[PDB]
Structures are given as structure tokens and as C-alpha cells.
PDB file of C-alpha atoms and ligand atoms in Angstrom:
ATOM      1  CA  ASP U   1       0.000   0.000   0.000  1.00  0.00           C
ATOM      2  CA  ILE U   2       1.094   3.588  -0.689  1.00  0.00           C
ATOM      3  CA  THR U   3       0.466   7.148   0.453  1.00  0.00           C
ATOM      4  CA  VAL U   4       0.058   9.819  -2.223  1.00  0.00           C
ATOM      5  CA  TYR U   5       0.289  13.541  -1.422  1.00  0.00           C
ATOM      6  CA  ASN U   6      -2.272  14.924  -3.870  1.00  0.00           C
ATOM      7  CA  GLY U   7      -2.331  18.450  -5.300  1.00  0.00           C
ATOM      8  CA  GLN U   8      -4.516  17.420  -8.243  1.00  0.00           C
ATOM      9  CA  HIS U   9      -8.294  17.785  -8.424  1.00  0.00           C
ATOM     10  CA  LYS U  10      -9.648  15.306  -5.843  1.00  0.00           C
ATOM     11  CA  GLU U  11     -12.162  13.545  -8.090  1.00  0.00           C
ATOM     12  CA  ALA U  12      -9.382  12.899 -10.657  1.00  0.00           C
ATOM     13  CA  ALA U  13      -6.908  11.599  -8.046  1.00  0.00           C
ATOM     14  CA  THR U  14      -9.632   9.418  -6.504  1.00  0.00           C
ATOM     15  CA  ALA U  15     -10.411   7.952  -9.928  1.00  0.00           C
ATOM     16  CA  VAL U  16      -6.802   7.073 -10.878  1.00  0.00           C
ATOM     17  CA  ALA U  17      -6.267   5.696  -7.354  1.00  0.00           C
ATOM     18  CA  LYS U  18      -9.325   3.450  -7.655  1.00  0.00           C
ATOM     19  CA  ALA U  19      -8.228   2.230 -11.103  1.00  0.00           C
ATOM     20  CA  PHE U  20      -4.756   1.476  -9.675  1.00  0.00           C
ATOM     21  CA  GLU U  21      -6.121  -0.599  -6.792  1.00  0.00           C
ATOM     22  CA  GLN U  22      -8.447  -2.457  -9.195  1.00  0.00           C
ATOM     23  CA  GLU U  23      -5.556  -3.331 -11.559  1.00  0.00           C
ATOM     24  CA  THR U  24      -2.906  -4.210  -8.940  1.00  0.00           C
ATOM     25  CA  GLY U  25      -4.657  -4.685  -5.581  1.00  0.00           C
ATOM     26  CA  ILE U  26      -2.373  -2.079  -3.963  1.00  0.00           C
ATOM     27  CA  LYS U  27      -4.341   0.373  -1.817  1.00  0.00           C
ATOM     28  CA  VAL U  28      -3.771   4.129  -2.143  1.00  0.00           C
ATOM     29  CA  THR U  29      -4.239   6.690   0.623  1.00  0.00           C
ATOM     30  CA  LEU U  30      -4.607  10.255  -0.647  1.00  0.00           C
ATOM     31  CA  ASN U  31      -3.446  13.209   1.502  1.00  0.00           C
ATOM     32  CA  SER U  32      -4.829  16.212  -0.391  1.00  0.00           C
ATOM     33  CA  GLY U  33      -4.121  19.939  -0.335  1.00  0.00           C
ATOM     34  CA  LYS U  34      -2.471  22.688  -2.368  1.00  0.00           C
ATOM     35  CA  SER U  35       0.601  21.687  -4.357  1.00  0.00           C
ATOM     36  CA  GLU U  36       2.960  24.416  -3.079  1.00  0.00           C
ATOM     37  CA  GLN U  37       1.882  23.613   0.487  1.00  0.00           C
ATOM     38  CA  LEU U  38       2.489  19.889   0.004  1.00  0.00           C
ATOM     39  CA  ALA U  39       5.811  20.675  -1.686  1.00  0.00           C
ATOM     40  CA  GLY U  40       6.871  22.707   1.355  1.00  0.00           C
ATOM     41  CA  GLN U  41       5.778  19.920   3.684  1.00  0.00           C
ATOM     42  CA  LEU U  42       7.748  17.363   1.655  1.00  0.00           C
ATOM     43  CA  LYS U  43      10.922  19.506   2.031  1.00  0.00           C
ATOM     44  CA  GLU U  44      10.432  19.959   5.804  1.00  0.00           C
ATOM     45  CA  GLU U  45       9.648  16.275   6.375  1.00  0.00           C
ATOM     46  CA  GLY U  46      12.692  15.359   4.287  1.00  0.00           C
ATOM     47  CA  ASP U  47      13.822  11.781   4.895  1.00  0.00           C
ATOM     48  CA  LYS U  48      10.998  11.205   7.448  1.00  0.00           C
ATOM     49  CA  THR U  49       8.163  11.849   4.969  1.00  0.00           C
ATOM     50  CA  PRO U  50       5.427   9.177   4.827  1.00  0.00           C
ATOM     51  CA  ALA U  51       4.715  10.260   1.230  1.00  0.00           C
ATOM     52  CA  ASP U  52       5.469   7.652  -1.433  1.00  0.00           C
ATOM     53  CA  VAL U  53       4.300   9.717  -4.421  1.00  0.00           C
ATOM     54  CA  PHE U  54       3.555  13.397  -5.063  1.00  0.00           C
ATOM     55  CA  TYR U  55       0.709  13.752  -7.597  1.00  0.00           C
ATOM     56  CA  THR U  56       0.272  17.354  -8.795  1.00  0.00           C
ATOM     57  CA  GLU U  57      -1.638  19.649 -11.178  1.00  0.00           C
ATOM     58  CA  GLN U  58       1.511  21.699 -11.842  1.00  0.00           C
ATOM     59  CA  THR U  59       4.909  20.132 -12.692  1.00  0.00           C
ATOM     60  CA  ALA U  60       6.584  23.471 -11.834  1.00  0.00           C
ATOM     61  CA  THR U  61       6.123  22.416  -8.196  1.00  0.00           C
ATOM     62  CA  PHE U  62       8.647  19.556  -8.751  1.00  0.00           C
ATOM     63  CA  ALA U  63      11.707  21.777  -9.596  1.00  0.00           C
ATOM     64  CA  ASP U  64      12.404  22.762  -5.978  1.00  0.00           C
ATOM     65  CA  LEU U  65      12.007  19.191  -4.730  1.00  0.00           C
ATOM     66  CA  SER U  66      14.269  17.921  -7.501  1.00  0.00           C
ATOM     67  CA  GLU U  67      17.054  20.397  -6.685  1.00  0.00           C
ATOM     68  CA  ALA U  68      16.653  19.707  -2.934  1.00  0.00           C
ATOM     69  CA  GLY U  69      17.518  16.073  -3.742  1.00  0.00           C
ATOM     70  CA  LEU U  70      14.096  14.824  -2.613  1.00  0.00           C
ATOM     71  CA  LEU U  71      12.883  12.940  -5.721  1.00  0.00           C
ATOM     72  CA  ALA U  72      13.718   9.444  -6.921  1.00  0.00           C
ATOM     73  CA  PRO U  73      14.663   8.468 -10.458  1.00  0.00           C
ATOM     74  CA  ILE U  74      11.861   6.984 -12.532  1.00  0.00           C
ATOM     75  CA  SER U  75      12.244   4.681 -15.514  1.00  0.00           C
ATOM     76  CA  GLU U  76      13.336   6.259 -18.826  1.00  0.00           C
ATOM     77  CA  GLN U  77      10.847   3.898 -20.517  1.00  0.00           C
ATOM     78  CA  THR U  78       7.992   5.331 -18.431  1.00  0.00           C
ATOM     79  CA  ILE U  79       9.069   8.944 -19.128  1.00  0.00           C
ATOM     80  CA  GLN U  80       9.003   8.201 -22.871  1.00  0.00           C
ATOM     81  CA  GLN U  81       5.359   7.119 -22.678  1.00  0.00           C
ATOM     82  CA  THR U  82       4.270  10.762 -22.427  1.00  0.00           C
ATOM     83  CA  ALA U  83       7.237  12.533 -24.015  1.00  0.00           C
ATOM     84  CA  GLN U  84       5.485  14.094 -27.028  1.00  0.00           C
ATOM     85  CA  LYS U  85       7.121  17.125 -28.648  1.00  0.00           C
ATOM     86  CA  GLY U  86       6.548  20.153 -26.377  1.00  0.00           C
ATOM     87  CA  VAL U  87       6.079  18.139 -23.150  1.00  0.00           C
ATOM     88  CA  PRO U  88       8.339  19.262 -20.248  1.00  0.00           C
ATOM     89  CA  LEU U  89      10.973  16.689 -19.231  1.00  0.00           C
ATOM     90  CA  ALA U  90      12.676  16.371 -15.861  1.00  0.00           C
ATOM     91  CA  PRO U  91      16.421  16.898 -16.580  1.00  0.00           C
ATOM     92  CA  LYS U  92      17.239  14.509 -13.711  1.00  0.00           C
ATOM     93  CA  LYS U  93      14.506  12.089 -14.862  1.00  0.00           C
ATOM     94  CA  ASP U  94      12.917  12.366 -11.381  1.00  0.00           C
ATOM     95  CA  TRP U  95       9.355  13.340 -12.316  1.00  0.00           C
ATOM     96  CA  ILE U  96       6.954  12.885 -15.251  1.00  0.00           C
ATOM     97  CA  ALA U  97       4.436  15.082 -17.047  1.00  0.00           C
ATOM     98  CA  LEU U  98       1.140  13.175 -17.459  1.00  0.00           C
ATOM     99  CA  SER U  99      -1.580  15.538 -18.763  1.00  0.00           C
ATOM    100  CA  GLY U 100      -2.345  19.162 -19.523  1.00  0.00           C
ATOM    101  CA  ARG U 101      -4.812  22.029 -19.359  1.00  0.00           C
ATOM    102  CA  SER U 102      -4.952  24.775 -21.977  1.00  0.00           C
ATOM    103  CA  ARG U 103      -5.724  28.452 -22.024  1.00  0.00           C
ATOM    104  CA  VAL U 104      -8.427  29.165 -24.595  1.00  0.00           C
ATOM    105  CA  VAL U 105     -10.854  31.799 -25.849  1.00  0.00           C
ATOM    106  CA  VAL U 106     -14.523  30.960 -25.425  1.00  0.00           C
ATOM    107  CA  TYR U 107     -16.989  32.897 -27.593  1.00  0.00           C
ATOM    108  CA  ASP U 108     -20.725  33.257 -28.342  1.00  0.00           C
ATOM    109  CA  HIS U 109     -21.015  31.809 -31.852  1.00  0.00           C
ATOM    110  CA  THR U 110     -24.413  33.480 -32.393  1.00  0.00           C
ATOM    111  CA  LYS U 111     -22.670  36.853 -32.108  1.00  0.00           C
ATOM    112  CA  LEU U 112     -19.189  36.029 -33.455  1.00  0.00           C
ATOM    113  CA  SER U 113     -17.371  33.556 -35.706  1.00  0.00           C
ATOM    114  CA  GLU U 114     -13.718  32.487 -36.013  1.00  0.00           C
ATOM    115  CA  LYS U 115     -13.396  35.430 -38.425  1.00  0.00           C
ATOM    116  CA  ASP U 116     -13.777  37.746 -35.404  1.00  0.00           C
ATOM    117  CA  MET U 117     -11.072  35.930 -33.405  1.00  0.00           C
ATOM    118  CA  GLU U 118      -7.424  37.037 -33.114  1.00  0.00           C
ATOM    119  CA  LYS U 119      -4.129  35.419 -34.140  1.00  0.00           C
ATOM    120  CA  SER U 120      -2.537  36.299 -30.773  1.00  0.00           C
ATOM    121  CA  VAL U 121      -3.902  36.521 -27.217  1.00  0.00           C
ATOM    122  CA  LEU U 122      -2.164  39.917 -27.167  1.00  0.00           C
ATOM    123  CA  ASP U 123      -4.700  41.309 -29.612  1.00  0.00           C
ATOM    124  CA  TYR U 124      -7.742  40.681 -27.363  1.00  0.00           C
ATOM    125  CA  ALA U 125      -6.462  43.466 -25.068  1.00  0.00           C
ATOM    126  CA  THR U 126      -7.182  46.161 -27.710  1.00  0.00           C
ATOM    127  CA  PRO U 127      -9.938  48.770 -28.313  1.00  0.00           C
ATOM    128  CA  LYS U 128     -11.901  46.455 -30.677  1.00  0.00           C
ATOM    129  CA  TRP U 129     -12.656  44.259 -27.638  1.00  0.00           C
ATOM    130  CA  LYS U 130     -13.727  47.179 -25.430  1.00  0.00           C
ATOM    131  CA  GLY U 131     -16.482  45.915 -23.071  1.00  0.00           C
ATOM    132  CA  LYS U 132     -16.455  42.586 -24.924  1.00  0.00           C
ATOM    133  CA  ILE U 133     -13.650  40.353 -23.566  1.00  0.00           C
ATOM    134  CA  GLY U 134     -14.012  38.689 -20.175  1.00  0.00           C
ATOM    135  CA  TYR U 135     -11.021  37.756 -18.029  1.00  0.00           C
ATOM    136  CA  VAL U 136     -10.357  36.401 -14.537  1.00  0.00           C
ATOM    137  CA  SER U 137      -7.248  37.968 -12.982  1.00  0.00           C
ATOM    138  CA  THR U 138      -7.458  35.900  -9.761  1.00  0.00           C
ATOM    139  CA  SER U 139      -6.991  32.366 -11.086  1.00  0.00           C
ATOM    140  CA  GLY U 140      -3.656  30.545 -11.067  1.00  0.00           C
ATOM    141  CA  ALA U 141      -3.619  30.050 -14.835  1.00  0.00           C
ATOM    142  CA  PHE U 142      -4.006  33.808 -15.329  1.00  0.00           C
ATOM    143  CA  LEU U 143      -0.800  34.234 -13.322  1.00  0.00           C
ATOM    144  CA  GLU U 144       0.926  31.588 -15.458  1.00  0.00           C
ATOM    145  CA  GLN U 145      -0.197  33.438 -18.590  1.00  0.00           C
ATOM    146  CA  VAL U 146       1.442  36.645 -17.354  1.00  0.00           C
ATOM    147  CA  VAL U 147       4.625  34.708 -16.529  1.00  0.00           C
ATOM    148  CA  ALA U 148       4.544  33.164 -20.018  1.00  0.00           C
ATOM    149  CA  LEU U 149       4.090  36.569 -21.665  1.00  0.00           C
ATOM    150  CA  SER U 150       7.053  38.071 -19.740  1.00  0.00           C
ATOM    151  CA  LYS U 151       9.318  35.154 -20.664  1.00  0.00           C
ATOM    152  CA  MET U 152       8.266  34.999 -24.326  1.00  0.00           C
ATOM    153  CA  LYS U 153       7.763  38.723 -25.027  1.00  0.00           C
ATOM    154  CA  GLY U 154       9.264  40.699 -22.127  1.00  0.00           C
ATOM    155  CA  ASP U 155       7.722  42.710 -19.272  1.00  0.00           C
ATOM    156  CA  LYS U 156       6.802  45.668 -21.457  1.00  0.00           C
ATOM    157  CA  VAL U 157       4.488  43.552 -23.642  1.00  0.00           C
ATOM    158  CA  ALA U 158       3.117  41.713 -20.574  1.00  0.00           C
ATOM    159  CA  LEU U 159       2.352  44.992 -18.802  1.00  0.00           C
ATOM    160  CA  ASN U 160       0.884  46.541 -21.952  1.00  0.00           C
ATOM    161  CA  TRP U 161      -1.470  43.511 -22.235  1.00  0.00           C
ATOM    162  CA  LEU U 162      -2.557  43.760 -18.590  1.00  0.00           C
ATOM    163  CA  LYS U 163      -3.174  47.513 -19.055  1.00  0.00           C
ATOM    164  CA  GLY U 164      -5.114  46.640 -22.202  1.00  0.00           C
ATOM    165  CA  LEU U 165      -7.323  44.254 -20.213  1.00  0.00           C
ATOM    166  CA  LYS U 166      -7.841  46.805 -17.455  1.00  0.00           C
ATOM    167  CA  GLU U 167      -9.035  49.341 -20.040  1.00  0.00           C
ATOM    168  CA  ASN U 168     -10.884  47.009 -22.438  1.00  0.00           C
ATOM    169  CA  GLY U 169     -11.804  43.888 -20.498  1.00  0.00           C
ATOM    170  CA  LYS U 170     -14.684  42.845 -18.254  1.00  0.00           C
ATOM    171  CA  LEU U 171     -13.457  41.375 -14.940  1.00  0.00           C
ATOM    172  CA  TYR U 172     -15.147  38.249 -13.570  1.00  0.00           C
ATOM    173  CA  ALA U 173     -14.506  36.780 -10.152  1.00  0.00           C
ATOM    174  CA  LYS U 174     -14.168  33.149 -11.252  1.00  0.00           C
ATOM    175  CA  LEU U 175     -13.720  31.202 -14.477  1.00  0.00           C
ATOM    176  CA  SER U 176     -17.158  29.563 -14.189  1.00  0.00           C
ATOM    177  CA  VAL U 177     -18.656  33.065 -13.961  1.00  0.00           C
ATOM    178  CA  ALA U 178     -16.778  34.259 -17.099  1.00  0.00           C
ATOM    179  CA  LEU U 179     -17.981  31.188 -19.001  1.00  0.00           C
ATOM    180  CA  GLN U 180     -21.613  31.738 -17.932  1.00  0.00           C
ATOM    181  CA  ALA U 181     -21.420  35.392 -18.942  1.00  0.00           C
ATOM    182  CA  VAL U 182     -20.563  34.373 -22.509  1.00  0.00           C
ATOM    183  CA  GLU U 183     -23.337  31.724 -22.514  1.00  0.00           C
ATOM    184  CA  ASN U 184     -25.904  34.195 -21.147  1.00  0.00           C
ATOM    185  CA  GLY U 185     -24.958  36.954 -23.608  1.00  0.00           C
ATOM    186  CA  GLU U 186     -23.399  39.436 -21.181  1.00  0.00           C
ATOM    187  CA  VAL U 187     -20.085  39.386 -23.060  1.00  0.00           C
ATOM    188  CA  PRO U 188     -19.322  37.819 -26.478  1.00  0.00           C
ATOM    189  CA  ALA U 189     -15.911  36.322 -25.492  1.00  0.00           C
ATOM    190  CA  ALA U 190     -13.712  35.441 -22.499  1.00  0.00           C
ATOM    191  CA  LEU U 191     -10.254  34.091 -21.718  1.00  0.00           C
ATOM    192  CA  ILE U 192     -10.672  30.825 -19.798  1.00  0.00           C
ATOM    193  CA  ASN U 193      -9.267  27.301 -19.378  1.00  0.00           C
ATOM    194  CA  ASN U 194     -10.457  24.480 -21.657  1.00  0.00           C
ATOM    195  CA  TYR U 195     -11.920  22.084 -19.053  1.00  0.00           C
ATOM    196  CA  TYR U 196     -14.609  24.603 -17.987  1.00  0.00           C
ATOM    197  CA  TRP U 197     -16.149  24.546 -21.479  1.00  0.00           C
ATOM    198  CA  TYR U 198     -15.701  20.801 -21.966  1.00  0.00           C
ATOM    199  CA  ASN U 199     -17.342  20.120 -18.583  1.00  0.00           C
ATOM    200  CA  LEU U 200     -20.317  22.330 -19.428  1.00  0.00           C
ATOM    201  CA  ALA U 201     -20.644  20.686 -22.860  1.00  0.00           C
ATOM    202  CA  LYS U 202     -20.606  17.180 -21.324  1.00  0.00           C
ATOM    203  CA  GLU U 203     -23.338  17.967 -18.794  1.00  0.00           C
ATOM    204  CA  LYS U 204     -25.667  20.156 -20.916  1.00  0.00           C
ATOM    205  CA  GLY U 205     -24.887  18.887 -24.421  1.00  0.00           C
ATOM    206  CA  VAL U 206     -23.055  20.999 -27.017  1.00  0.00           C
ATOM    207  CA  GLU U 207     -26.277  21.405 -29.020  1.00  0.00           C
ATOM    208  CA  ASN U 208     -27.665  23.353 -26.032  1.00  0.00           C
ATOM    209  CA  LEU U 209     -24.700  25.763 -25.784  1.00  0.00           C
ATOM    210  CA  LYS U 210     -24.281  29.145 -27.487  1.00  0.00           C
ATOM    211  CA  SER U 211     -20.509  29.203 -26.771  1.00  0.00           C
ATOM    212  CA  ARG U 212     -17.617  27.605 -28.686  1.00  0.00           C
ATOM    213  CA  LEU U 213     -13.795  27.519 -28.262  1.00  0.00           C
ATOM    214  CA  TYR U 214     -11.098  29.178 -30.304  1.00  0.00           C
ATOM    215  CA  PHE U 215      -7.492  27.990 -29.887  1.00  0.00           C
ATOM    216  CA  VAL U 216      -4.826  30.455 -31.015  1.00  0.00           C
ATOM    217  CA  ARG U 217      -2.243  27.685 -31.602  1.00  0.00           C
ATOM    218  CA  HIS U 218       1.045  28.562 -33.453  1.00  0.00           C
ATOM    219  CA  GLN U 219       3.039  28.545 -30.186  1.00  0.00           C
ATOM    220  CA  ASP U 220       1.309  31.807 -29.214  1.00  0.00           C
ATOM    221  CA  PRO U 221       1.578  32.726 -25.510  1.00  0.00           C
ATOM    222  CA  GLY U 222      -2.216  32.211 -25.482  1.00  0.00           C
ATOM    223  CA  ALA U 223      -1.701  28.557 -26.395  1.00  0.00           C
ATOM    224  CA  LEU U 224      -0.169  28.007 -22.932  1.00  0.00           C
ATOM    225  CA  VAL U 225      -0.581  24.528 -21.491  1.00  0.00           C
ATOM    226  CA  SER U 226      -0.143  23.793 -17.779  1.00  0.00           C
ATOM    227  CA  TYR U 227       1.052  20.282 -17.021  1.00  0.00           C
ATOM    228  CA  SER U 228       0.057  17.778 -14.339  1.00  0.00           C
ATOM    229  CA  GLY U 229       2.511  15.101 -13.252  1.00  0.00           C
ATOM    230  CA  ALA U 230       3.902  12.749 -10.624  1.00  0.00           C
ATOM    231  CA  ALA U 231       7.099  12.025  -8.678  1.00  0.00           C
ATOM    232  CA  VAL U 232       8.362   9.275  -6.383  1.00  0.00           C
ATOM    233  CA  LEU U 233       9.851  10.529  -3.098  1.00  0.00           C
ATOM    234  CA  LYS U 234      13.481   9.481  -2.592  1.00  0.00           C
ATOM    235  CA  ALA U 235      12.660   9.010   1.110  1.00  0.00           C
ATOM    236  CA  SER U 236      10.081   6.299   0.290  1.00  0.00           C
ATOM    237  CA  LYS U 237      10.876   2.882   1.721  1.00  0.00           C
ATOM    238  CA  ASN U 238       8.324   1.372  -0.686  1.00  0.00           C
ATOM    239  CA  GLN U 239       9.998   2.291  -3.991  1.00  0.00           C
ATOM    240  CA  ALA U 240       8.661  -0.710  -5.888  1.00  0.00           C
ATOM    241  CA  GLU U 241       4.976   0.113  -5.327  1.00  0.00           C
ATOM    242  CA  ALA U 242       5.570   3.865  -5.706  1.00  0.00           C
ATOM    243  CA  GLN U 243       7.283   3.315  -9.071  1.00  0.00           C
ATOM    244  CA  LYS U 244       4.487   0.917  -9.979  1.00  0.00           C
ATOM    245  CA  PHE U 245       1.910   3.688  -9.380  1.00  0.00           C
ATOM    246  CA  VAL U 246       3.773   6.273 -11.463  1.00  0.00           C
ATOM    247  CA  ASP U 247       4.268   3.683 -14.254  1.00  0.00           C
ATOM    248  CA  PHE U 248       0.543   3.041 -14.053  1.00  0.00           C
ATOM    249  CA  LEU U 249      -0.299   6.750 -14.379  1.00  0.00           C
ATOM    250  CA  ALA U 250       1.689   6.821 -17.646  1.00  0.00           C
ATOM    251  CA  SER U 251       0.065   3.609 -18.919  1.00  0.00           C
ATOM    252  CA  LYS U 252      -2.859   3.423 -21.349  1.00  0.00           C
ATOM    253  CA  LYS U 253      -5.194   2.365 -18.524  1.00  0.00           C
ATOM    254  CA  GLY U 254      -4.037   5.040 -16.061  1.00  0.00           C
ATOM    255  CA  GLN U 255      -4.402   7.776 -18.656  1.00  0.00           C
ATOM    256  CA  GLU U 256      -7.886   6.465 -19.543  1.00  0.00           C
ATOM    257  CA  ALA U 257      -8.882   6.736 -15.899  1.00  0.00           C
ATOM    258  CA  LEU U 258      -7.619  10.307 -15.647  1.00  0.00           C
ATOM    259  CA  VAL U 259      -9.245  11.590 -18.869  1.00  0.00           C
ATOM    260  CA  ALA U 260     -12.702  10.230 -17.946  1.00  0.00           C
ATOM    261  CA  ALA U 261     -12.561  11.988 -14.563  1.00  0.00           C
ATOM    262  CA  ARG U 262     -11.289  15.344 -15.827  1.00  0.00           C
ATOM    263  CA  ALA U 263     -11.018  17.205 -19.118  1.00  0.00           C
ATOM    264  CA  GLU U 264      -7.223  17.323 -19.244  1.00  0.00           C
ATOM    265  CA  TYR U 265      -5.312  16.422 -22.419  1.00  0.00           C
ATOM    266  CA  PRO U 266      -3.606  13.014 -22.104  1.00  0.00           C
ATOM    267  CA  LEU U 267       0.073  12.890 -23.142  1.00  0.00           C
ATOM    268  CA  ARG U 268       0.037   9.308 -24.432  1.00  0.00           C
ATOM    269  CA  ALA U 269      -0.794   9.454 -28.167  1.00  0.00           C
ATOM    270  CA  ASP U 270      -2.963   6.315 -28.050  1.00  0.00           C
ATOM    271  CA  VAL U 271      -5.557   7.626 -25.566  1.00  0.00           C
ATOM    272  CA  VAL U 272      -8.781   9.422 -26.571  1.00  0.00           C
ATOM    273  CA  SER U 273     -10.692  11.664 -24.158  1.00  0.00           C
ATOM    274  CA  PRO U 274     -14.458  11.153 -23.749  1.00  0.00           C
ATOM    275  CA  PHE U 275     -14.804  14.931 -23.249  1.00  0.00           C
ATOM    276  CA  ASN U 276     -14.043  15.147 -26.980  1.00  0.00           C
ATOM    277  CA  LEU U 277     -10.694  16.994 -26.587  1.00  0.00           C
ATOM    278  CA  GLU U 278      -8.408  17.398 -29.582  1.00  0.00           C
ATOM    279  CA  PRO U 279      -4.972  15.718 -29.488  1.00  0.00           C
ATOM    280  CA  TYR U 280      -2.355  17.516 -27.435  1.00  0.00           C
ATOM    281  CA  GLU U 281      -0.068  17.958 -30.483  1.00  0.00           C
ATOM    282  CA  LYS U 282      -2.756  19.935 -32.353  1.00  0.00           C
ATOM    283  CA  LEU U 283      -2.781  22.647 -29.635  1.00  0.00           C
ATOM    284  CA  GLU U 284       0.705  23.790 -30.707  1.00  0.00           C
ATOM    285  CA  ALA U 285       1.481  24.985 -27.160  1.00  0.00           C
ATOM    286  CA  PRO U 286       4.577  27.141 -26.589  1.00  0.00           C
ATOM    287  CA  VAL U 287       7.655  25.815 -24.799  1.00  0.00           C
ATOM    288  CA  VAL U 288       8.063  27.829 -21.602  1.00  0.00           C
ATOM    289  CA  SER U 289      10.385  27.351 -18.620  1.00  0.00           C
ATOM    290  CA  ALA U 290       8.719  26.297 -15.336  1.00  0.00           C
ATOM    291  CA  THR U 291       7.136  28.951 -13.121  1.00  0.00           C
ATOM    292  CA  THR U 292       9.237  29.756 -10.013  1.00  0.00           C
ATOM    293  CA  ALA U 293       8.050  31.625  -6.916  1.00  0.00           C
ATOM    294  CA  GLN U 294      10.108  34.600  -8.119  1.00  0.00           C
ATOM    295  CA  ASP U 295       8.278  34.551 -11.488  1.00  0.00           C
ATOM    296  CA  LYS U 296       4.982  34.665  -9.544  1.00  0.00           C
ATOM    297  CA  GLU U 297       6.092  37.592  -7.398  1.00  0.00           C
ATOM    298  CA  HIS U 298       7.203  39.508 -10.511  1.00  0.00           C
ATOM    299  CA  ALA U 299       3.917  38.789 -12.279  1.00  0.00           C
ATOM    300  CA  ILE U 300       1.857  39.754  -9.218  1.00  0.00           C
ATOM    301  CA  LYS U 301       3.640  43.129  -9.261  1.00  0.00           C
ATOM    302  CA  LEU U 302       2.805  43.563 -12.975  1.00  0.00           C
ATOM    303  CA  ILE U 303      -0.864  42.892 -12.262  1.00  0.00           C
ATOM    304  CA  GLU U 304      -0.809  45.497  -9.449  1.00  0.00           C
ATOM    305  CA  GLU U 305       1.039  48.024 -11.599  1.00  0.00           C
ATOM    306  CA  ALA U 306      -1.640  47.589 -14.294  1.00  0.00           C
ATOM    307  CA  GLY U 307      -4.371  48.378 -11.726  1.00  0.00           C
ATOM    308  CA  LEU U 308      -5.463  44.717 -11.785  1.00  0.00           C
TER     309      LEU U 308
HETATM  310 FE1   FE O 401      -8.229  27.691 -10.803  1.00  0.00          FE
HETATM  311 FE1   FE O 402      -8.871  25.897  -9.077  1.00  0.00          FE
HETATM  312 FE1   FE O 403      -8.457  25.513 -12.566  1.00  0.00          FE
HETATM  313 FE1   FE O 404     -11.620  26.500 -11.059  1.00  0.00          FE
END
């Protein structure tokens, strides 16, 4: 039996855990919380951690554990199972990217078509979208987007975009609220994450939705994907079962379990999502270095400078 510190969505972790125990007979105990909290706990606990695996929504959280010497090597053959072009790789081969979530533009297709959409996410922060583009400055993926813009285009472009949103955008408190505002006709478009639309479409039926998605693609900053993943703790005294769980997460069956529970893009090529997601490779996501705490702090300051 193993203990998994879980930063991923609980329903998703519960589903992959249940599929693991059904396939192997090895029981999984989840200890859930926020990834950066669990990461900090794993560093404090050090060689006395009870954690066998760290399962996360954000592979950026692994960098600090890796450089603190806290993560175990995993099999190169497992890592290759999800190593599509564009997928982040652990340089020390001590964690694995498993699935992703994408930034996207949702839009009311009864008011707009793909003709009205922009080539770059940068262009939505312009006077043509005055009063007409929703955004959610508070979510974690919004912060990652700012970090991505700074790294790919510099602080001046990132700040200009934030200022553009302040002036031209409509602020919503949560992503679900932005999505509903497009559906209900309050605003013709919003910047959101993919799974919100795919979840709504699964429950209500796409035929009953006014909104559709537009992916910028072309390695645009707006094509940003955030990656979920897993690591084995070096301090684990049950390496065989821990490695077995991570191998399972990268297997056809483990990926199937994940993609049914949550509308993340699988990173195995031979797995198809029931949420009707396009293949990861078609997103054409940019390659971006992992977010550090310092990147966050810098981005937070940009958001404040822009007036939010
Ligand atoms: Fe969120
Ligand atoms: Fe959230
Ligand atoms: Fe989210
Ligand atoms: Fe959310």
C-alpha cells in the first residue's frame, strides 16, 4: 500500500487511485491539499516523509524538490510514454508530465465567428474588444499566462497587455462566472481554461450551448498549457509500489482513468478523451520554462502596476 500527497483535483486523483487498486490490488491513501503547500511539507519532512508519491496539477512544483535532492529516479521507458514534442521533461529524470490544461478563448457563436477571433492573445487586449472580452485575474492560470508573456515577449508587452485588459476587459470573479457570462450573452468572449467549457458541454450537451472555443495555436503565448505530473519521493521505503503507481499513471489504462474523470489532455498518443478533446499535439502549445516563486512575485507586481 502507498500514500500519495495529492495536489490534483480530488475527483481525478480518486479515480486514478481506484483504477490502480483495481488493476494491482495495492491500496492508495490520498493526503490532499495545495501543491505548493504539500511541496513545502515534503521539504520539511525530508527523509521522514510518509509520502510515497507526489501527484500534482503543476509540474513546476517539482523543480524545488528535484534540486533539494528529494525525488527518486523513474524509468526512462515510463518517461518516454508521455514525451510528445513540447512536453516538459525532468532533466534529472525524477518526475513525469502526465496531462495538460490549456488556455483558450470561449466565444458566443451566435454573435461572433472564427473570423472575429485574433491570431494572438495579445490582440484581445485592444480597443476592438472594449467591453467585450471577459477575463479572470485571480486564477492561477491567469498568473501563469502573465509569466509566459514576460518570458516569451518581455515585461513591457506583458504589462501593456494587462493595461489593455484593465481598459478594455470585463473582470469576472471566477472562471465559471466568465464562461456563464458568454453563454448568457453578457459578453461575447472570455479568456478561460479548456476544461470549464468541456465540462459544461458534457453535462448540458453541445447542441444546447451558445458558446464555442477558439485555440490560437502557433506557439502563441495564449496557447499556454499547464502540465500535471507525478514524482516518487526518494525518502520512500516502498519504492517498488511507488514506481508501480507512477508507471501506471503513464500507462494506457491510467491515462484512460484520468481523462474520464477530468477534461485534461492526455500525453500518451494512443488515448482518446471522452470529453471530446483534440490531441495535445494539435494545440501547438509554446515551450516555456517552469514557473518559479520569483516569477509569480514579478507577475503579481505587474498585475498590481496595471491596476489589476
Ligand atoms: Fe483555478
Ligand atoms: Fe482551481
Ligand atoms: Fe483551474
Ligand atoms: Fe476553477
